[PDB]
Symmetry: C2
Subunit: 451 residues, 2 copies
């Protein structure tokens, strides 16, 4: 069971490429120290240009390393097996034989917010139902986006059990006090007391190791399984999506861009820099016939501006063809090869979540101009310091290996902001010096779903 | 038969480490454009310090990746299998049953140069003997380093056949002469194919799975057989190891001064950087350096300027001295020297026989690895290059590049043979052109 030749050649090529980059940077930075004025700026720009191509060659070799010696086919098979297992468990939970006797969790969709926020409310309900072995019952009467209900757009969340009948009923009071309550009604997350453990960003302990073999952010993978089940379309929506795909000429490669302007302002150029950079990366391993962008935005003037400012790009948008508009936007963004947006937007986060269900590991196929991935209502997102940090400025925090860091965000400039939970200090630290603290929870594993 | 969890975690951490380095560089280089004077120089220095630690963290993760999920154990087993195979073949070639009837190649060690050049002459003789299925006969009478000759330090190269007897003798004229006398490589015509940097075609694929520079591994197999020590030299080395306190981690430094000059400070920048890398994965109790040099002022200079280092030298207890220096350099965890020096190349070659893949465990202040008399060392361009200055050459993917050297600054110098043009090109844009030769495989050595 030996090492593959391609694997070893690529590993050594990545090591050598990184070494050569370090040789280059040592030489060129020392030369910059002795320049000034226009020559300093001209040479700095040239260094940046060269560095970019060098960096993308290293990233390309890393991509090949992830695929070599059967790794891509195996990752695809394991990711498929994992989602089939979870979807099987969810479907088993949701379709009891005898609805009148089934334990149930009632969720109301009419949270006071937009479509993404309402979808995520249902997900939060669903994850707790799954954790407490309760069938999710979804109440959607007079839903803002479709007054006919949830089932006018998506499939019902159960085929056998959509009725709320039960011997006992009560508001959520905790898994222990609700032990003998057949039907529990759940409020929005920011009213939930006591909080159960079945919340993001933890993942099921029984799946955690398998997921780390496949996926770079198991927490978002776990969320995405409930999104996947919820958005199973009714046949008319499925047909509308297929026909819109043709009408728009949506085809690959394509990068999705979501520009949310209705309040945090970012000019179109700050999105497109990352779009152009990713197309440069793709072109190192595939022919790019045309640079396509699927643009979703609440700014009605932006599409025309983008087309005129970037005449070498093809812009695709559903503006030509409300609930329909957001559903289609989320769909096409989720199908793109890469996603550039602001994760402060619920819409972009939904698209990123759905994206994880379409590939073995799409966890890194985004760039956010502000927030890192999060789920409203999640438990604290912590990291563990791996290397020490001594602050250079007063805005930086010290770190020793083992310190728990509560991460607020990545500034996408080498530094993150967070709080050192051994010291109580909040500030900046080098992003590379921490690792993610993955939290696991003992969920039911529904072994009966395998028979 | 799936993917290992540690393997995947480490791959993603390397990828993310590289992305974070790029975020940092993009941000900081844009800041530098708007600085001046002492502020520009203070921030450039700070960026370089921060970049060093970030780079070493990536290189550490790559080291772990090379070892994870059984890879280190497999690489060691396969590298051991490969050297056992080749040593078995050499030993079979060298020990025919009837010396009077064996085909022979005669090599005279007394080349007009120093010990490292003489040893490499014998290696060159040996590789051609191996290629032609001739038993190597080594003549070392009147050896400048010992009147008793080769066997006063190293084992005879054969146990059964050490004389020049036969029915016909002649000077090399190209591949029915039983005893052929080989000259120095500079006088060799016609050249046979059994020369560095090519490797045996039957081993090339297995070597690529194990080792980062198969050419030097192949050279090192003949070095290994030649320098088998006599029992008294074996004991002397063991005693020296004890008397000197040679132990790990330890970095080898060879400073050749007898005619280009490099000050001790230049070697020590690379020593210090490597000890910083090692400290990320192991405890470094004391920073030990084995220092070898022809300059009598240098050991004292180093000790006085680097009081935080322990400098080891066999001078603290000429053929004896070079052999011990080469031994301890070859045993070090890392080697800093000038590959223009035959002695340092010998130590690097021996080092390859002591680890699964030590190909990258050096820093040369001048030349890349080479073997005197080798055939042209070529590379293949992988990415196009458009020259920015007049000192640079253009390249298109597939162009054959004849490499003269690496300038250790991001650029190499060489000739684009398609264009006949010589100049600089980005080192990362080429890959090595590995040459293979059909050598005998000595199947009889397995029986």
């Amino acid at each position: 069971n030996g090492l593959g030749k391609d694997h070893e050649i690529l590993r050594r090529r990545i090591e050598n490429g990184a070494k050569e980059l370090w040789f280059f940077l040592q030489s060129e930075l020392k030369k910059l120290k002795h320049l000034e004025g226009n020559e300093l700026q001209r040479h700095a720009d040239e260094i940046l240009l060269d560095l970019g191509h060098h960096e993308r060659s290293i990233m390309t070799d890393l991509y090949y390393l992830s695929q070599t010696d059967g790794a891509g086919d195996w990752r695809e098979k394991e990711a498929k097996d994992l989602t089939e297992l979870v979807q099987r468990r969810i479907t088993y939970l949701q379709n009891p034989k005898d609805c009148s006797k089934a334990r149930k969790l009632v969720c109301n969709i009419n949270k006071g917010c937009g479509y993404g926020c309402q979808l995520h409310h249902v997900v939060y309900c669903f994850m707790i139902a799954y954790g407490t072995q309760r069938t999710l019952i979804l109440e959607s009467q007079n839903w803002r986006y479709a007054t006919g209900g949830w089932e006018t757009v998506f499939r019902p969340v159960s085929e056998t059990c959509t009725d709320r009948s039960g011997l006992s009923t009560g508001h959520w009071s905790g898994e222990v006090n609700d032990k003998n309550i057949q039907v529990v009604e759940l409020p929005i997350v920011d009213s939930l007391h006591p909080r159960p453990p079945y919340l993001p960003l933890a993942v099921p302990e029984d799946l955690a190791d398998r997921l780390l073999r496949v996926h770079g952010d198991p927490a978002v993978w776990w969320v995405s399984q409930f999104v996947k089940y919820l958005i199973r379309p009714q046949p008319w929506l499925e047909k509308e999506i297929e026909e819109a795909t043709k009408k728009l000429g949506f085809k690959h490669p394509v990068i999705g861009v979501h520009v949310r302007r209705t309040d945090a302002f970012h000019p179109i150029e700050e999105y497109m820099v990352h779009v152009e950079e990713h197309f440069q990366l793709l072109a190192r391993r595939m022919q790019v016939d045309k640079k396509r962008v699927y643009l979703a935005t609440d700014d009605p003037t932006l599409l025309k501006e983008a087309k005129t400012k970037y005449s070498n790009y093809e812009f695709i948008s559903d503006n030509s063809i409300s609930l329909r508009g957001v559903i289609l936007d989320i769909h096409f963004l989720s199908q793109a090869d890469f996603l550039v947006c602001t994760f402060s937007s619920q819409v972009c986060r939904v698209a990123y979540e759905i994206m994880q269900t379409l590939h073995p590991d799409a966890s890194a196929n985004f760039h956010s101009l502000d927030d890192i991935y999060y789920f409203g209502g999640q438990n604290a997102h912590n990291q563990i310091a791996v290397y020490p940090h001594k602050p250079r400025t007063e805005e930086e925090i010290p770190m020793e290996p083992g310190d728990i860091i509560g991460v607020a965000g990545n500034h996408w400039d080498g530094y993150s902001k967070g709080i050192n939970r051994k010291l109580g200090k909040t500030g900046l630290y080098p992003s590379y010096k921490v690792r993610e603290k993955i939290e696991t929870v003992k969920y039911p594993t529904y072994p009966e779903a395998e028979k």
